[PDB]
Amino acid sequence: GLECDGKVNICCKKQFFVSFKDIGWNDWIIAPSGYHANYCEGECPSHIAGTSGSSLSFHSTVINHYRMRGHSPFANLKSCCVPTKLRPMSMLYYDDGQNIIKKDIQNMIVEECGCS
Amino acid sequence: GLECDGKVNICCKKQFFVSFKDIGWNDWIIAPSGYHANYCEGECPSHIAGTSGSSLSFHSTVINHYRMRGHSPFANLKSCCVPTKLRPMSMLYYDDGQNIIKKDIQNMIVEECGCS
Amino acid sequence: GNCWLRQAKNGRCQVLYKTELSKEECCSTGRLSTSWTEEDVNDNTLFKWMIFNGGAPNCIPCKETCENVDCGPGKKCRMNKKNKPRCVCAPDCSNITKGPVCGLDGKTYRNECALLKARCKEQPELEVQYQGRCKKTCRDVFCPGSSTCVVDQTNNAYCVTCNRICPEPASSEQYLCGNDGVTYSSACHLRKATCLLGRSIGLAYEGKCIKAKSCEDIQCTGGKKCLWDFKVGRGRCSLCDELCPDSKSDEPVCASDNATYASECAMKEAACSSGVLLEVKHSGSCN
Amino acid sequence: GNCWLRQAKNGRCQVLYKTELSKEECCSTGRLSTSWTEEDVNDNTLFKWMIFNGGAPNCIPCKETCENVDCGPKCRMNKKNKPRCVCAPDCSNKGPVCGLDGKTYRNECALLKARCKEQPELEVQYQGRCKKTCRDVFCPGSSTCVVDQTNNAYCVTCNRICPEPSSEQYLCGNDGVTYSSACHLRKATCLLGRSIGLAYEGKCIKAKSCEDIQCTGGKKCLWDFKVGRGRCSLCDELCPDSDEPVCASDNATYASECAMKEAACSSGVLLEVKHSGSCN
Ligand SMILES: [Ir+3]
Ligand SMILES: [Ir+3]
Ligand SMILES: [Ir+3]
Ligand SMILES: [Ir+3]
């Protein structure tokens, strides 16, 4: 539930607005022109993952007990800060026959971040 | 929806059996004794991110298009192989009051892996 | 002790920040929902606490009032039904009062402000695309500025801006032929015509438009097959690999030929197999 | 071509392995789902193809017959001839079983079947229809029948070896018995086969009222007029604005099980649940 406040400096949900121009997608995407996709960045301690409340908390905790006890598979496993809850957005684009189409594209927007 | 069956080297799900003694949960967890938690492992190419069809695919392709141009925030960002779908499981255990409970704990098992 | 980020439904403390701390030290930062926990437990307990207690027990909110609760523009502090500070949406209304309006999401908002309200609350991308009730056809839809009217597969109008600058090709392979019998220089040009007209025209096949009598004269690229329309006298290349997986979530259709097809997908199997174009007529079944 | 790893309900290729291959090269590893695309496309095409066609078009499945299919421990030609690796565990080798999941499985093999399906942990705890009381039980071997909150008989093993303990590791059982460790309470709870519950920490104090009980950890005390003993339970949870309303031991209908406790908490009297719904 951690929106990135301003130097809390943890695995948090950052804001970013994608411009379809920049990506070279202004082309086949009719509307909108860009959106707030956001990204996940921050770090993953051992005390934030289990407490995070995310859908990864439990699992990341189990693996972590193993990572602490140095089990080879996990010894080299990372524990990244990634999106854990994503929400859909509507788009109006040209498909492949160049027809005007309106569809709900899923997980276009990063809603909740977490460690994992 | 990819199983590490072998040596592909792609972000795939690896089977992993979590024993509850190893972890030290053997005591408050009546049953079962352990479970297949599985974990995600694998390198995250790009051809694989937008082409994997995971919940993190559209987003990962957007960001990455910004990374192939060099936006500032994303230079040091690597698209990590993490869980995208987690199924829950039933356990018989002791609550804070040492009572016997059969509850469903969420996101205990990793069912799908994906780059993101 | 331990200081936290939020209060889950339970009234509990989730999202731990600091350790071996004091209430005030934590309650110093003017963050709306930040709470304090009292007891110092082994981290494992914290864990179990999230299986068992669904968070951390005995959660002391750092804010019981609304003082110096900074929500940002558009959000104000509205004391509750239980008296907890909740930042509600409060955009600027009288600055742009004006009749019903149409949102870029296809839904009609009572007036503009009702829309802005809805933006703040749950959708950061919402804007007014055109005035009045959102309508189905481009007929009486007064689009603003340079925007033009256009509609989609389900027939919803949208005010949009059409790119009218397309480069000369420098290839005869970039050439495309439209269902409208027109030869287009690029997919850019085709789009430009699709937009200016406000309706999908569709690609017939790659290359120049040749004047075919039947699918014989048509060369389909991309593993696509030729479907013909005897009513209009034209050909088209289409993908014919779709499978039509089981489901009774099948909302059968009535095709161009008036034959109830199990599903749109099945309509297309048919057409593909028979080499004759089938588009969708009505919704339902073919009575 | 392009080798892919899955075929969808759609019929399109998802999950790319690597580009610039040949069909036979791809279908080399005997894997059921693997598929091939002849057209070579690297650009965004592959991406849009996801949105547009919900997968890459013109998927050439690698295996048309079960021929050459290692499932590892079953391949069945299914109805539309789509080779499918199915579940077939060694059965032959009795009794309508009760799965550790609280569900009655018709045969013992029916279980093994379900196990291979989606329940990687499934097993038989006790033979016969899953019962709701420890009454009848022949817990295989060592076990002790036990029961849960909604009454489902489970056959478990109990730890009897708890390290002899400290003056306050001690706990007071809702049975009124002072126990040394959570382990002994557990041990007694398991052996008894039913829930004992922790009353408060420290030795069992003989109290007339809750005034006589020092709850530890923010918890409050509730009197069980039912037994004439004290109990320490948490009193901070919030009964939120999906709620399945209840009927209490005070014979008062409370809206949420939670609201029952707000009251019990503010009254200093333990309110347990009688039934689901509304009193009456
Ligand atoms: Ir945002
Ligand atoms: Ir598996
Ligand atoms: Ir413990
Ligand atoms: Ir229609």
UniProtKB/Swiss-Prot annotation, chains A, B:
GO terms for biological process: activin receptor signaling pathway; androgen metabolic process; androst-4-ene-3,17-dione biosynthetic process; autophagy; cardiac fibroblast cell development; cell differentiation; cell surface receptor signaling pathway; cell-cell signaling. Coiled coil: none annotated. GO terms for molecular function: cytokine activity; growth factor activity; hormone activity; identical protein binding; peptide hormone binding; protein-containing complex binding; type II activin receptor binding. It is found in: Secreted. Its main location: secreted. GO terms for cellular component: activin A complex; enzyme activator complex; extracellular region; extracellular space; inhibin A complex; perinuclear region of cytoplasm. Disulfide bonds join 4-12, 11-81, 40-113, 44-115. Keywords: Cleavage on pair of basic residues, Disulfide bond, Glycoprotein, Growth factor, Hormone, Secreted, Signal. Dimeric, linked by one or more disulfide bonds. Inhibin A is a dimer of alpha/INHA and beta-A/INHBA. Activin A is a homodimer of beta-A/INHBA. Activin AB is a dimer of beta-A/INHBA and beta-B/INHBB. Interacts with FST and FSTL3; these interactions prevent activin A interaction to its type II receptor. Activin A interacts with ACVR2A. Activin A interacts with BMPR2. Inhibin A interacts with ACVR1; this interaction creates a non-signaling complex (NSC) that inhibits ACVR1-mediated BMP signaling. Inhibin A interacts with ACVR2A. Inhibins/activins are involved in regulating a number of diverse functions such as hypothalamic and pituitary hormone secretion, gonadal hormone secretion, germ cell development and maturation, erythroid differentiation, insulin secretion, nerve cell survival, embryonic axial development or bone growth, depending on their subunit composition. Belongs to the TGF-beta family. This is Inhibin beta A chain. The gene is INHBA.
From Swiss-Prot, chain C:
Keywords: Disulfide bond, Glycoprotein, Nucleus, Repeat, Secreted, Signal. Isoform 1 is the predominant isoform in serum but is undetectable in follicular fluid. In the embryo, strong expression is seen in the palatal epithelia, including the medial edge epithelial and midline epithelial seam of the palatal shelves. Less pronounced expression is also seen throughout the palatal shelf and tongue mesenchyme. It is found in: Secreted; Nucleus, Nucleolus. Residues 83-136, 156-211, 234-287 form the Kazal-like domain. Changing residue 26 to A: More than 95% loss of binding to activin A/INHBA and FSH secretion inhibition. Glycans are attached at residues 95, 258. GO terms for molecular function: activin binding; activin receptor antagonist activity; heparan sulfate proteoglycan binding. GO terms for cellular component: cytoplasm; extracellular region; extracellular space; nucleolus. Residues 65-88, 137-160, 214-238 form the Follistatin-like domain. Induction: By glucose deprivation. Disulfide bonds join 3-26, 13-59, 27-62, 66-77, 71-87, 89-120, 93-113, 102-134, 138-149, 143-159, 162-195, 166-188, 177-209, 215-226, 220-237, 240-272, 244-265, 254-286. Changing residue 23 to A: About 30% of binding to activin A/INHBA. Residues 1-74 form the TB domain. It comes from the Eukaryota. GO terms for biological process: ameloblast differentiation; BMP signaling pathway; cell differentiation; female gonad development; gamete generation; hair follicle morphogenesis; hematopoietic progenitor cell differentiation; keratinocyte proliferation. Interacts with GDF11. Interacts with activin A/INHBA. Interacts with MYOSTATIN/MSTN. Multifunctional regulatory protein whose primary function is to antagonize members of the transforming growth factor beta (TGF-beta) superfamily including activin, myostatin, GDF11 or bone morphogenetic proteins (BMPs). Mechanistically, binds to these ligands in the extracellular space, blocking their type II receptor-binding site to inhibit downstream signaling. Plays an essential role in muscle fiber formation and growth both by preventing the repressive effects of myostatin and through SMAD3/AKT/mTOR signaling independently of myostatin. This is Follistatin. It comes from Homo sapiens (Human). The gene is FST. The chain holds residues 30 to 317 of 344 of the full protein.
